[PDB]
Enzyme design. Structure first.
Site, PDB file in Angstrom:
ATOM      1  N   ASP A  35       0.821  -1.211   0.000  1.00  0.00           N
ATOM      2  CA  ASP A  35       0.000   0.000   0.000  1.00  0.00           C
ATOM      3  C   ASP A  35       0.858   1.265   0.000  1.00  0.00           C
ATOM      4  O   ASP A  35       1.353   1.677   1.041  1.00  0.00           O
ATOM      5  CB  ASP A  35      -0.920  -0.023   1.229  1.00  0.00           C
ATOM      6  CG  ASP A  35      -1.828   1.186   1.317  1.00  0.00           C
ATOM      7  OD1 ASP A  35      -1.948   1.884   0.297  1.00  0.00           O
ATOM      8  OD2 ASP A  35      -2.439   1.414   2.401  1.00  0.00           O
ATOM      9  N   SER A 199      -0.794  15.573 -12.116  1.00  0.00           N
ATOM     10  CA  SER A 199      -1.050  15.197 -13.498  1.00  0.00           C
ATOM     11  C   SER A 199      -1.314  16.438 -14.325  1.00  0.00           C
ATOM     12  O   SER A 199      -1.838  17.423 -13.827  1.00  0.00           O
ATOM     13  CB  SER A 199      -2.244  14.252 -13.548  1.00  0.00           C
ATOM     14  OG  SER A 199      -2.670  13.990 -14.872  1.00  0.00           O
TER      15      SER A 199
END
Length: 330
Positions: A35, A199
């Protein structure tokens, strides 16, 4: 040193991925959920409340000659999906894919929430976010990657998740045969303890690319892709019959649909998520309403590039003094 381990989806939907991990001496192999959105290595154990164990493999520190109680140390964690676990702490030897760390904090669960109990395939979590998020008190502990880093050939790990198929986590090297073209690297902020990056935009299907900054986290422990409501609305508007259902808890779409792809930007590069990766199947057995793999982050407070996005790429988690993230197509 390096390590290399195969990671395997737990079910037919790729709801999560498990990676075998050797703990203790002699080795006890547990299948852990790696994770990159948390920083605790915790396991089902001989100390876990019996009624909260249902099929998991447990770590038994009393059977490990290298286990030592970390005296006074406790831990308690709550995850974004509302699940939680807590317990005490041992140090022991932990190996992943041939890479060994001695003195790793292994957090032994005394209590786990129902979602963990109900998932027989996950024996615990191995956190790969920054150690500043580790919950051990009163002495915070380091992640497996942080402990291994100085010994690694290069201070990196990579995630290569499969779509309905196994993939690989590598430590300490970049497998140049595992991706196509070049890797595009992008800046990371560690201010919130995550692999947080920005992004450069998105496209829906064959549509034009929208240049827009989307801050979010690379999180292998989250199944879906969670993005701003504007972006998610633009995606689902291209699927006839798709709608947001408050009763179901997100966007659903007719199971008869063919889903469009979704592209996200990494600098001037583009990663394409095929439409099929966005299908999470019937909302309940036999339903013709299917659950979407792109959902709104509104009210999460952060955008999450979860498995849906990451499995479309070869992803480099560069833990150099100034960390960065790399993405390649594959």
């Amino acid at each position: 040193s390096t390590g290399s381990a195969t990671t395997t989806p737990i079910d037919s939907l790729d709801d999560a991925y498990i990676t075998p991990v050797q703990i203790g001496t002699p080795a006890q192999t547990l299948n852990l959920d790696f994770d990159t959105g948390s920083s605790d290595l915790w396991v089902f154990s001989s100390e876990t409340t019996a009624s909260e164990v249902d099929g998991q493999t447990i770590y038994t520190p009393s059977k490990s000659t290298t286990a030592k109680l970390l005296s006074g140390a406790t831990w308690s964690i709550s995850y974004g999906d509302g699940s939680s676990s807590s317990g005490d702490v041992y140090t022991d030897t932990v190996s992943v894919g041939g890479l060994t760390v001695t003195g790793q904090a292994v957090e032994s669960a005394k209590k786990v929430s129902s979602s963990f109990t109900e998932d027989s395939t996950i024996d615990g979590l191995l956190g790969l976010a920054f150690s500043t998020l580790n919950t051990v008190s009163p002495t915070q502990q380091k992640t497996f990657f942080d402990n291994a880093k100085a010994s690694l050939d290069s201070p990196v790990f990579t995630a290569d998740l499969g779509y309905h198929a196994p993939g690989t986590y590598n430590f300490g090297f970049i497998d140049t045969t595992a991706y196509t073209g070049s890797i595009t690297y992008t800046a990371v902020s560690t201010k919130q303890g995550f692999w947080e990056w920005t992004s450069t935009g998105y496209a829906v299907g064959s549509g034009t690319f929208k240049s827009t900054s989307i801050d979010g986290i690379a999180d292998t422990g989250t199944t879906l892709l969670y993005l701003p409501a504007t972006v998610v609305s633009a995606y689902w508007a291209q699927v006839s019959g798709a709608k947001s259902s408050s009763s179901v808890g997100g966007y659903v779409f007719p199971c008869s649909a063919t889903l469009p792809s979704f592209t996200f930007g990494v600098g001037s590069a583009r990663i394409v998520i095929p439409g099929d990766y966005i299908d999470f199947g019937p909302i309940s057995t036999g339903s013709s309403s299917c659950f979407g793999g792109i959902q709104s982050s509104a009210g999460i407070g952060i955008n999450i590039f979860g498995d849906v996005a990451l499995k479309a790429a070869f992803v480099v988690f560069n833990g150099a003094t100034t960390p960065t993230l790399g993405f390649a197509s594959k």
